[PDB]
Amino acid sequence: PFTADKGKCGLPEIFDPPEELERKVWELARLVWQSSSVVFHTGAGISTASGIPDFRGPHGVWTMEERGLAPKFDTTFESARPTQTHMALVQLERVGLLRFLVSQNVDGLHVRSGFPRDKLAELHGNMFVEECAKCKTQYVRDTVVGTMGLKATGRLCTVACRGELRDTILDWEDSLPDRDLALADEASRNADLSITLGTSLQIRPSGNLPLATKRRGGRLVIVNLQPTKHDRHADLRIHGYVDEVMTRLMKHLGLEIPAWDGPRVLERALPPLPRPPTPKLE
Amino acid sequence: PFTADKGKCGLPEIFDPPEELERKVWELARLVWQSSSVVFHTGAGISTASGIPDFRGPHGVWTMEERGLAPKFDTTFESARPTQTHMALVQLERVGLLRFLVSQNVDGLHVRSGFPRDKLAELHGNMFVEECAKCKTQYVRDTVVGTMGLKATGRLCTVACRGELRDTILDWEDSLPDRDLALADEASRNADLSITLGTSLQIRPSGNLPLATKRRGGRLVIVNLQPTKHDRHADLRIHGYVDEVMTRLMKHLGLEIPAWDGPRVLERALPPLPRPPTPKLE
Amino acid sequence: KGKCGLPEIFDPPEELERKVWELARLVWQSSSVVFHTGAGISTASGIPDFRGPHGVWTMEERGLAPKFDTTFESARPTQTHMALVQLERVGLLRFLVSQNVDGLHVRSGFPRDKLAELHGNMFVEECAKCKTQYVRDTVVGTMGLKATGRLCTVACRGELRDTILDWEDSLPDRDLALADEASRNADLSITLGTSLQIRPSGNLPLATKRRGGRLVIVNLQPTKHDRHADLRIHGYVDEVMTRLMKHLGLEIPAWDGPRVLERALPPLPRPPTPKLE
Amino acid sequence: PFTADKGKCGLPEIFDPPEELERKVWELARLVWQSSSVVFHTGAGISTASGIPDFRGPHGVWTMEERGLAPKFDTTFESARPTQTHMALVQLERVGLLRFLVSQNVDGLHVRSGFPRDKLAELHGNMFVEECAKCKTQYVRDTVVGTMGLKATGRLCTVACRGELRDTILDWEDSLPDRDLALADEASRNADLSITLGTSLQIRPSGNLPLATKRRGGRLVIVNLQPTKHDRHADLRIHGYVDEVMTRLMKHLGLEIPAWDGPRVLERALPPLPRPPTPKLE
Amino acid sequence: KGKCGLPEIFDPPEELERKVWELARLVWQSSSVVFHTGAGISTASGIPDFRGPHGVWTMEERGLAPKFDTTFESARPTQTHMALVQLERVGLLRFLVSQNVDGLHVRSGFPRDKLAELHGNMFVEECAKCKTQYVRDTVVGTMGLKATGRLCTVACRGELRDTILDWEDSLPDRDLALADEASRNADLSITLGTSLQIRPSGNLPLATKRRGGRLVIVNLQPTKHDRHADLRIHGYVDEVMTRLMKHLGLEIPAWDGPRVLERALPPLPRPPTPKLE
Amino acid sequence: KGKCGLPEIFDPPEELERKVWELARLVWQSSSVVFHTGAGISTASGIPDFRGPHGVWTMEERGLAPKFDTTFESARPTQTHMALVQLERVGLLRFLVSQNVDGLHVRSGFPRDKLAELHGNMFVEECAKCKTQYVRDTVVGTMGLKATGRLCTVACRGELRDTILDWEDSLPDRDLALADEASRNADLSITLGTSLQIRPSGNLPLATKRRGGRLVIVNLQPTKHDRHADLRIHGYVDEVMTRLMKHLGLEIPAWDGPRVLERALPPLPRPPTPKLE
Ligand SMILES: CCCNC(=O)[C@H](CNC(=O)Cn1cc(C(N)=O)c(=O)[nH]c1=O)NC(=O)CCc1nc(-c2cccnc2)no1
Ligand SMILES: CCCNC(=O)[C@H](CNC(=O)Cn1cc(C(N)=O)c(=O)[nH]c1=O)NC(=O)CCc1nc(-c2cccnc2)no1
Ligand SMILES: CCCNC(=O)[C@H](CNC(=O)Cn1cc(C(N)=O)c(=O)[nH]c1=O)NC(=O)CCc1nc(-c2cccnc2)no1
Ligand SMILES: Nc1ncnc2c1ncn2[C@@H]1O[C@H](COP(=O)(O)OP(=O)(O)OC[C@H]2O[C@H](O)[C@H](O)[C@@H]2O)[C@@H](O)[C@H]1O
Ligand SMILES: Nc1ncnc2c1ncn2[C@@H]1O[C@H](COP(=O)(O)OP(=O)(O)OC[C@H]2O[C@H](O)[C@H](O)[C@@H]2O)[C@@H](O)[C@H]1O
Ligand SMILES: Nc1ncnc2c1ncn2[C@@H]1O[C@H](COP(=O)(O)OP(=O)(O)OC[C@H]2O[C@H](O)[C@H](O)[C@@H]2O)[C@@H](O)[C@H]1O
Ligand SMILES: Nc1ncnc2c1ncn2[C@@H]1O[C@H](COP(=O)(O)OP(=O)(O)OC[C@H]2O[C@H](O)[C@H](O)[C@@H]2O)[C@@H](O)[C@H]1O
Ligand SMILES: Nc1ncnc2c1ncn2[C@@H]1O[C@H](COP(=O)(O)OP(=O)(O)OC[C@H]2O[C@H](O)[C@H](O)[C@@H]2O)[C@@H](O)[C@H]1O
Ligand SMILES: Nc1ncnc2c1ncn2[C@@H]1O[C@H](COP(=O)(O)OP(=O)(O)OC[C@H]2O[C@H](O)[C@H](O)[C@@H]2O)[C@@H](O)[C@H]1O
Ligand SMILES: [Zn+2]
Ligand SMILES: [Zn+2]
Ligand SMILES: [Zn+2]
Ligand SMILES: [Zn+2]
Ligand SMILES: [Zn+2]
Ligand SMILES: [Zn+2]
């Protein structure tokens, strides 16, 4: 609680100059085209552009705490809109270029974007999600569930059970949801391409899953404004804003970024849509 | 034919005053959110708003016959458009809030609305539908099949059979289609919420299926302008026009009522669409 | 209240089909088409008429009451309402003259500047003082040009009154002027679900005739002026408008729920016209 | 190469007069409505309207060669747009009226139209498609693969293999892809309706597959401006432009011809959409 | 009939790409862009040209006949036709001057008030008396300004005639006036699939030059005025218009089938312009 | 630079809800609504403000720097930006007065003829000579009305300059004229995320008051003119605009990416108005 190790907070930002930036995004486009199974890992940096502060950035929650100051929110969790990044991911899954999405984020935005829950692992929980301790049925609310740390929310299970509903936000000492972890791990191991977005990769085991991909010769790309724990393991490191990178990527892949219909929950991935043919690369 | 018992015809209409109306529709919204499996039962009252007279209402077919007068049609069966109600049901199935639809209606409008035939039981038949007596293959026509009472229509089966095509409109003495009945029954038993719309519930076994739900503690709601046979069994009775109720319900559920593309037949339910997250209710 | 509950007439299918082709000809050939509607175009949305078998008056005579299958608020525009919307959008409808108080033309999105609502609108109140109109989301509580108990809010605090004519009232000068002018300059007037029994409304169609203008009547029952029409189509207006739009190569557009459009928008692209003669 | 038999080139075109044309398209509409399984066979004539010359027509590749002249292209293969015909076929598959599509065309347009690859047999190959000689994984490029005759393209396999990529365009002496052929054959045999579009039916076994359908009493329709090898076997021969025929057909079937989103590849058929009810025919 | 069947020229890819970027520059920089089209923009819809390898004239000389892959009625607008539609919609096209009789610009939905059809339109007849135009759904049966056998229907019974110029006929005064005025005031004229060999049509582009206006020619073959152009792009017009719209950040819109739009609608939102120099 | 970093105020939910209903009343009742925006409406797209807790000035005082979560080029319009787009489209917004230099109103598709950008726009340069404006796809490289190093291309070769006011500069005469006129004639001014601390911009809202016009302020922090407002809503502008559009029965439209619309298009159909009193 007080003792919690919060890692390296407030490290200097790095910005690749424009031409290096454009050439790296081109290479990401190349890796994606070539890959059989692509897995995305996201953290708090993909939501900063919607007004939600991250943890370890210059104005992050833990950074600010270290300086005796406060983080700033520019939205509520209910009023937050998914970023261009979140919506690019929706599309990448729909056209079959994204196999699995692993997120450390609690902010509920991938769910709310309409990303399919069976291709998503929410490793640290979701603030809109409460779970029955008896039957394990989950409920995805339109408002944040008012507790954190796996506590009773005060509501009961309505399954055709009356079990005590509890939040899914892990405290420091709590181990990860086993189903989420087992599926993120399997996906990570079997991927031939793992792409990290807006995560410093400092938390175990979450930040370690992209390394699993480096097994059997998989490639690792890291998109992030600050250094990350596994920088030396990356085949490609892109230092820029994740929305600028993802919009350029989509442009290269010949994909529109889909409109957000408002908060909407999709349990199961729909059938894959058509996508553009692949370039001749070599 | 002449002997047929036509039940209680022409009973006085009941109208819940506005504030009671709005509070009951709110509670229906609450029951739907809470339910695992929701089954809808429809009858003739859901089509009166498209110009098709019902049977037992004040200007109903059997009511008018009793007074020596005639029912009035404001449309042909071919020219009838599905109501706001019919289209709300299309949407509820698409987003996964409706498990099954049971209808006593012959008017062909749920089919024509594009409601999926494998989630629909047409207990008393469909006027556009003719069936091979040999192979049992059904054909869904753009025009009413000119006979009633399971008679030869005059056309033959084209299955890659030459069997005699017959109508599917039950006469009084004819027992129900076994497949339709078996599936309506299963759905009704296993539901935890059954909602009746525009049916007096006077015909066996059709009107009795919503009671099956009251087994193992399922809830029964009845929407209807007139009294119904099972009024005392209802957890909730809403006395108002079904379009006013369904539009308000959709508003609360955060669902648009979809546009009608014209007459269109869907054999199999598509994959479920995203829907809004559920409120915290208790 | 006039002749009520007269027998319905139904053209056989082959005739029905011939006559709609003939109406399509007239539309294609005409420069200025005016449409006149009454209560028959709302009966397929659950709103009774006045003088049909089960109409308001026809039922009152027999001691019966008319039946509603909807509230005014929860009524949806018919396929006919929406076809007229499209007809105006692609420049094939010049003006629309309605007897109907039921609010549906307005709520369909039809432009108010190309519509005369000769007998009022249940959803519309007007300021006794500044004459400003308000289109409400529910029926204005009164009938017969009475105080609704609301006051104007323009920049007035005038007394707002319903727009619903009692038997003795003069028609809106503005609406009637515009509807007369349109009727007079049309080379084609088409009536849809009106018995044509009220003055002056029922007679506006005849003004088209005075100029060599054609006149089409579309009605289940006999109307006052059947003798003056070049074509009478006995059938359900929805059936007739649906076939006609098909011939015109026009889709019937989706309703986006209640919506108020004050001014006609620029005209949309339309199908090329057939060779006729 | 030089020896290759190129069949009957440059035969006179036949045009059915308008009223005969309209009556035949009506009968095609009738056969389609009646059929359980409909299989389409296409060749080069369905792409002439996009600026790609056919082989045996009056200005065909082989015809012109015979007269010592050159064919004319009005587009590149990359810049070619699918015809009204190609897009009608997309729609017919989507609404479930087309079971399978067999094509002799190499021009890549059915793929690019977004026609589902698992309902398509490309008997003579696709110019955008290259294939690994090791693992047999196919790649669908945005540009024509620069070789013909099953040669090494120069690129290698990227499967999570490094096998030599080769083109899929058959030379004269090369036998057909076995998977494509086996599936076209199965479909053809089991169909009760086979419709040929823009093919002279002169190549074995491709042009012979529509005859398979005449087994067990299947019907054969041939749409083509010139005579075809199997003219005498046809139940119906329509002599006119394939776009005029298909647009009229769609009009009768009550189907819109869908918009082309640009080049887009769909591996697996989506779930079937609603379609209009069938007329009463007899 | 002039020089026919001249060799085709194909710019290599890298050049091709450079030149389209250069055309995008000119569009972005220009205030008033006029487009001039002839038969080369319809060849990818199966309609032969006149003077290309397999053109009407080129084939007639050699004893061959041209080949159609479509009827006029069943022809669809090209990607080029539809890009011009979009170009006018977002305010990047001022006027369109076409030599083409094939009906496609009109049927694409292009606004008739921003188009001069200098040689006629196969689908259009006109009243000898009142000069009223009719855009039909099929080709008017005649050529050379003849009676079609139909009569006017305005409010006239005038004799309707095709609009298709024979060799000896003066061009529509109205269309030619407007096309000259546009050509003169443009700072950019772009020609698409025209050999520029007919007077006066072929010369209208040169009028842009007289003012400091730029001139771009886009054509597989040499044209009359290659010497006066600032940029010549040798390639297929579809390829060139597709890349160009991509640079402009414009989608090519779907065709809703044959549709007739008389007047340009208000302009749509367009992408912001790049920094150039 | 004025009072910076003042404490935030948060209305409790029930109050919050009451006050938005009250703002919906005012919109429905008003004939002419002007909206005034500053840096608070862009903070939810990752662009810092000036005087909030972590604002440009508030941070500079404390030795801190403001933080960007986006580039100007990669910033997307907020739900607020897009709601204003819709509000203007259905005729419920008369004019928009912004202090914001960030380009978002323009890039949202908002019509330039109904917007005063009082302090400039990072994407806009202007010709010193002919005064022609250019809306670029990237930020113009300079600030303070300097040469950008590009020259005009109208039909001019004038020196193009940024439009970004330094502290000492007079506001665009044109934009300020129009914004004053609008403010004066509005019966409702609504401020969104502006502390109202700069002259003359901050004071334009008060001009509405002088006529019996209402004034609403929507801001997390105290503003200069809280004492003159009829309603103060302390909350996040996105939350407030979303609830309000829901009450108005308006959808918030999708962004089609950066797009420049010079002139307001004809008004769209809107929901009928509730009965109020
Ligand atoms: C991305 C950082 C921004 N902050 C957040 O996203 C919130 C905390 N937010 C607030 O306290 C502020 N707050 C503000 C609101 C408003 N904006 O007005 C509102 O409505 N609700 C609210 O809670 N999330 C969390 O506190 C949980 C983070 C979490 N960590 C772990 C974990 C597991 C294993 C090891 N180490 C940590 N599992 O869950
Ligand atoms: C909802 C009531 C309105 N009437 C209807 O829907 C029609 C009967 N309609 C007409 O006779 C008038 N008619 C009018 C047309 C036009 N409107 O011009 C037209 O085209 N065809 C036509 O038939 N349906 C029926 O007659 C069948 C009702 C039925 N009952 C049973 C059943 C089973 C077990 C026990 N008890 C009864 N199974 O089927
Ligand atoms: C439909 C006829 C038009 N021509 C085509 O489609 C091209 C050949 N085209 C060109 O040589 C010209 N060319 C032009 C381009 C441009 N238009 O600028 C371009 O980009 N590429 C290009 O190759 N296709 C073929 O050459 C292969 C035909 C094929 N036949 C067989 C086969 C199998 C069994 C028995 N008998 C034959 N398997 O594949
Ligand atoms: N717009 C942006 N573009 C690119 N990178 C960005 C952007 N915004 C921020 N970043 C980078 O995004 C990175 C975010 O890193 P951290 O703040 O550690 O977030 P986590 O998800 O990895 O924290 C993991 C867990 O630790 C906590 O205890 C919670 O339990 C979390 O669930 C920074 O390096 C920024 O530079
Ligand atoms: N707009 C409306 N809103 C609400 N309720 C309505 C509305 N319109 C009518 N109702 C009510 O809707 C109810 C309709 O009840 P019945 O007329 O018995 O129809 P069924 O489907 O139950 O008849 C069953 C079978 O019996 C026949 O023999 C046939 O075989 C039928 O298939 C009334 O109580 C109305 O008050
Ligand atoms: N679906 C239908 N299709 C065709 N005709 C129809 C349909 N439904 C009804 N009809 C015919 O539609 C006709 C409707 O005739 P009337 O009832 O006199 O309505 P009005 O608008 O002309 O009455 C005028 C005023 O009278 C009052 O005082 C009020 O002030 C009214 O404003 C009938 O003949 C039906 O046969
Ligand atoms: N618009 C049109 N409408 C109708 N028919 C048309 C049209 N255009 C052309 N046709 C007819 O379309 C027909 C096309 O016949 P062929 O040219 O033999 O093409 P294939 O696909 O059968 O050649 C098979 C293989 O042979 C080669 O060696 C390759 O390997 C091919 O893959 C003609 O009869 C035209 O009259
Ligand atoms: N896809 C293509 N891409 C580019 N250029 C093309 C394409 N297809 C053809 N071309 C070129 O397009 C050019 C077309 O040149 P011409 O055939 O003279 O057509 P006109 O419209 O200029 O003839 C004017 C009048 O002449 C008659 O008397 C009629 O009255 C006509 O109205 C060729 O040079 C091709 O190289
Ligand atoms: N999401 C939000 N919701 C509501 N209020 C917000 C939000 N975010 C910030 N605020 C409030 O938004 C307010 C923003 O106030 P200021 O920072 O002065 O911006 P200006 O546009 O008024 O500054 C004017 C000029 O000053 C400079 O010199 C430049 O020239 C500017 O153009 C704060 O009070 C926050 O409480
Ligand atoms: Zn439980
Ligand atoms: Zn059978
Ligand atoms: Zn007043
Ligand atoms: Zn391989
Ligand atoms: Zn004339
Ligand atoms: Zn200048």
Q: Which CATH class is domain D17-124+174-269?
A: alpha beta
Q: Do F270 and C260 touch (CB under 8 A)?
A: yes
User: E33-37 and A100-103: which strand pairing?
Assistant: unpaired
- Residue B31 near residue B236, CB atoms below 8 Å: yes
Residue to mutate (ligand 7; options D40, D42, D48, D56; most atoms within 8 A of CB): D56
Q: How far apart are CA B255 and CA B237, in angstroms?
A: 23
A56 known member of a binding site? yes
Mutate to test the interface with B, among D33, D39, D278 (most CBs of B within 10 A): D278
Q: How far apart are CA E132 and CA E122, in angstroms?
A: 16
Q: What are the tokens at C269?
A: 């692209």
- Residue A37 near residue A93, CB atoms below 8 Å: no
Q: How far apart are CA D162 and CA A92, in angstroms?
A: 26
Closest ligand to Cα E39: 8
DSSP assignment, residue B256? P
Ligand 1: centre distance to CA F18 (Å)? 29
Q: How far apart are CA C117 and CA C102, in angstroms?
A: 10
DSSP per position, F23-92? HHHHHHH-S-EEEEE-GGGSGGGT---SSSTT-HHHHHHTT-----SS-TTT----HHHHHHHHHHHTT-
Cβ-Cβ contacts under 8 Å between E and F: the total is 48
- The verdict on domain E120-168 having CATH code 2.20.28.200 is yes
Beta-carbon count within 10 A of D257 CB: 23
Residues of chain B with C-beta less than 8 angstroms from the C-beta of D36:
158-160
Q: Which CATH class is domain D125-173?
A: mainly beta
Q: How far apart are CA F107 and CA F47, in angstroms?
A: 15
Q: Is C119 helix (H, G, I), strand (E, B) or coil?
A: coil
D105 known member of a binding site? no
Q: Which protein residues have their CB within 5 A of the ion that is ligand 11?
A: B 132, 134-135, 157, 159, 161, 163
Helix axes A242-253, A84-94, angle to 10 degrees: 30
- The CATH H-level (homologous superfamily) assignment of domain E12-119+169-264 is TPP-binding domain (3.40.50.1220)
DSSP per position, A76-135? -TTTPPPPHHHHHHHHHHHTT---EEEE---S-HHHHHT-BGGGEEETT--TTEEEETTT
Q: What are the tokens at E5?
A: 């069947």
Beta-carbon count within 10 A of B2 CB: 3
Q: How far apart are CA F221 and CA F236, in angstroms?
A: 10
Helix axes E237-248, E13-29, angle to 10 degrees: 50
A161 known member of a binding site? yes
Q: How far apart are CA E123 and CA C275, in angstroms?
A: 10
Ligand 3 surroundings by CB, under 6 angstroms: D 44, 52-55, 61, 73, 76-77, 106-107, 124-125, 144, 148, 169-170, 172, 203
Q: Which atom of ligand 3 is found nearest the CA of D76?
A: 17
User: A152-156 and A164-167: which strand pairing?
Assistant: antiparallel
Breaks (C-N over 2.5 A) in chain E follow: 155
Q: How far apart are CA E15 and CA F25, in angstroms?
A: 62
**What sign does the CA torsion over E129, E131, E137, E142 have?**
positive
Residues of chain B with C-beta less than 8 angstroms from the C-beta of D218:
160
Peptide bond into B205 cis (omega under 30): yes
Q: How far apart are CA F149 and CA E277, in angstroms?
A: 8
Residues of chain E with C-beta less than 8 angstroms from the C-beta of F151:
277
Nearest to D79 among E73, E74, E236 (CB): E236
What Cα–Cα distance (Å) separates residue E115 from each residue in E104, E108, E178, E273? Answer: 12, 12, 9, 26
Beta strands in chain C (DSSP E): 33-37, 95-98, 108-111, 115-117, 124-127, 133-135, 147-151, 159-162, 188-192, 214-218, 231-233, 259-261
Closest ligand to Cα E125: 14
- Residue C48 near residue C67, CB atoms below 8 Å: yes
Residues of chain B with C-beta less than 8 angstroms from the C-beta of A263:
276-277
Q: How far apart are CA C147 and CA C5, in angstroms?
A: 35
What Cα–Cα distance (Å) separates residue F247 from each residue in C107, C197, E17? Answer: 18, 43, 52
Nearest to F74 among A50, A79, A243 (CB): A243
Ligand 8 surroundings by CB, under 6 angstroms: D 74; E 38-40, 43-44, 49-52, 55, 99, 119, 193-195, 197-198, 219-221, 236-237
Q: How far apart are CA B198 and CA B206, in angstroms?
A: 13
Q: Is B31 helix (H, G, I), strand (E, B) or coil?
A: helix
Q: How far apart are CA B26 and CA B252, in angstroms?
A: 7
- Please choose, from the candidates A262, A248, A270, A276, the residue with its C-alpha nearest in 3D space to the C-alpha of residue A111: A262
Q: Do A51 and F67 touch (CB under 8 A)?
A: no
**3-class SS string, chain E:** CCCCCCCCCCCCHHHHHHHHHHHHHHHHHCCCEEEEECHHHCHHHCCCCCCCCCCHHHHHHCCCCCCCCCCCCCCCCCHHHHHHHHHHHCCCCCEEEECCCCCHHHHEEEEHHHEEECCCCCCEEEECCCCCEEEECCCCCCCCCCEEEEECCCCCCCEEEECCCCCCCCCCHHHHHHHHHHHHHCCEEEEECCCCCCCCHHHHHHHHHCCCCEEEEECCCCCCCHHHCCEEECCCHHHHHHHHHHHHCCCCCCCCCCEEECCCCCCCCECCECCCC
Q: How far apart are CA C23 and CA C12, in angstroms?
A: 16
Residues of chain C with C-beta less than 8 angstroms from the C-beta of B78:
239
Q: How far apart are CA D133 and CA F152, in angstroms?
A: 58
| Chains D and F lie in contact, requiring 3 or more CB pairs less than 8 Å apart | no
R_g of chain F computed on alpha carbons:
18
- List residues of chain A with CB under 8 Å from any CB of chain B: 111-112, 114, 128, 139-143, 145, 154-156, 158-160, 261-268, 270-271
Q: How many residues does chain A have?
A: 282
Amino acid at A49: A
The finding on whether B196 has its CB within 6 A of some atom of ligand 5 is no
Nearest to A49 among F45, F54, F242 (CB): F45
Q: How far apart are CA A77 and CA B277, in angstroms?
A: 14
Q: Is D8 helix (H, G, I), strand (E, B) or coil?
A: coil
- Residue F201 near residue F99, CB atoms below 8 Å: yes
The finding on whether B199 has its CB within 6 A of some atom of ligand 5 is yes
What Cα–Cα distance (Å) separates residue B52 from each residue in B11, B45, B80, C123? Answer: 19, 9, 8, 27
Q: Is A247 helix (H, G, I), strand (E, B) or coil?
A: helix
D30 known member of a binding site? no
Q: How far apart are CA D197 and CA D247, in angstroms?
A: 13
Ligand 2: centre distance to CA B89 (Å)? 22
- Angstrom resolution of this structure: 1.8
Ligand 2 surroundings by CB, under 6 angstroms: B 44, 52-55, 61, 73, 76-77, 106-107, 124-125, 144, 148, 169-170, 172, 203
User: For the CA atoms of F151, F153, F154, F157, what is the dihedral angle to 10 degrees?
Assistant: 40
Beta-carbon count within 10 A of E199 CB: 10
Within 13 Å and on the Cβ side, how many CA atoms surround D149? Answer: 4
Angle (CA) F151-F157-F159 rounded to 5° is 50
Mutate to test the interface with C, among E126, E153, E265 (most CBs of C within 10 A): E153
How distant is the alpha carbon of residue B243 from its chain centre?
Answer: 13
How distant is the alpha carbon of residue C252 from its chain centre?
Answer: 17
- List residues of chain E with CB under 8 Å from any CB of chain F: 29, 31, 91, 187, 266-277
- Residue A257 near residue A91, CB atoms below 8 Å: yes
Nearest to D76 among E71, E79, E236 (CB): E236
User: For the CA atoms of F250, F256, F260, F263, what is the dihedral angle to 10 degrees?
Assistant: -30
C4 known member of a binding site? no
Residues of chain E with C-beta less than 8 angstroms from the C-beta of F132:
none
User: C33-37 and C188-192: which strand pairing?
Assistant: parallel
Residue C247: left (phi > 0), alpha (psi -120 to 50), or beta? Answer: alpha
What Cα–Cα distance (Å) separates residue A237 from each residue in A17, A196, A245, B58, E220? Answer: 13, 9, 12, 75, 46
Q: How far apart are CA B243 and CA B241, in angstroms?
A: 6
Residues of chain C with C-beta less than 8 angstroms from the C-beta of F187:
155
- Please choose, from the candidates E177, E35, E36, the residue with its C-alpha nearest in 3D space to the C-alpha of residue E94: E35
Ligand 7: centre distance to CA D220 (Å)? 18
Q: How many residues does chain D have?
A: 282
Q: Is B230 helix (H, G, I), strand (E, B) or coil?
A: coil
Protein residue with its CA nearest to atom 31 in ligand 5: B104
**Which part of chain E is CATH 2.20.28.200?**
120-168
Beta-carbon count within 10 A of B278 CB: 18
Q: Where are the alpha helices (DSSP H) in chain A?
A: 18-34, 61-66, 84-94, 109-113, 178-190, 209-212, 242-253
Q: How far apart are CA F136 and CA C27, in angstroms?
A: 49
Q: How far apart are CA D73 and CA D70, in angstroms?
A: 10
Beta-carbon count within 10 A of D62 CB: 18
Q: How far apart are CA E37 and CA D197, in angstroms?
A: 33
Q: Do B76 and C43 touch (CB under 8 A)?
A: no
Q: How far apart are CA E35 and CA E99, in angstroms?
A: 11
Q: Do C73 and B243 touch (CB under 8 A)?
A: no
Minimal Cα–Cα distance from E243 to chain D, Å? 10
Nearest to F273 among C134, C263, C265 (CB): C134
What Cα–Cα distance (Å) separates residue E57 from each residue in A163, B117, E146? Answer: 86, 60, 23
Beta-carbon count within 10 A of B42 CB: 25
- Residue F52 near residue F58, CB atoms below 8 Å: yes
Protein residue with its CA nearest to atom 7 in ligand 6: C40
- Residue B28 near residue B79, CB atoms below 8 Å: no
Helix axes E79-89, E237-248, angle to 10 degrees: 30
Ligand 3: centre distance to CA D142 (Å)? 17
E203's CB contacts (< 8 A; 6+ apart) are E196, E225
**Which part of chain D is CATH 3.40.50.1220?**
17-124+174-269
Minimal Cα–Cα distance from A240 to chain B, Å? 32
Protein residue with its CA nearest to atom 1 in ligand 2: B54
**Which part of chain E is CATH 3.40.50.1220?**
12-119+169-264
User: C108-111 and E214-218: which strand pairing?
Assistant: unpaired
- Please choose, from the candidates B49, B53, B74, the residue with its C-alpha nearest in 3D space to the C-alpha of residue C193: B74
A36's CB contacts (< 8 A; 6+ apart) are A192, D158, D159, D160
What Cα–Cα distance (Å) separates residue C165 from each residue in C3, C118, C121? Answer: 21, 9, 9
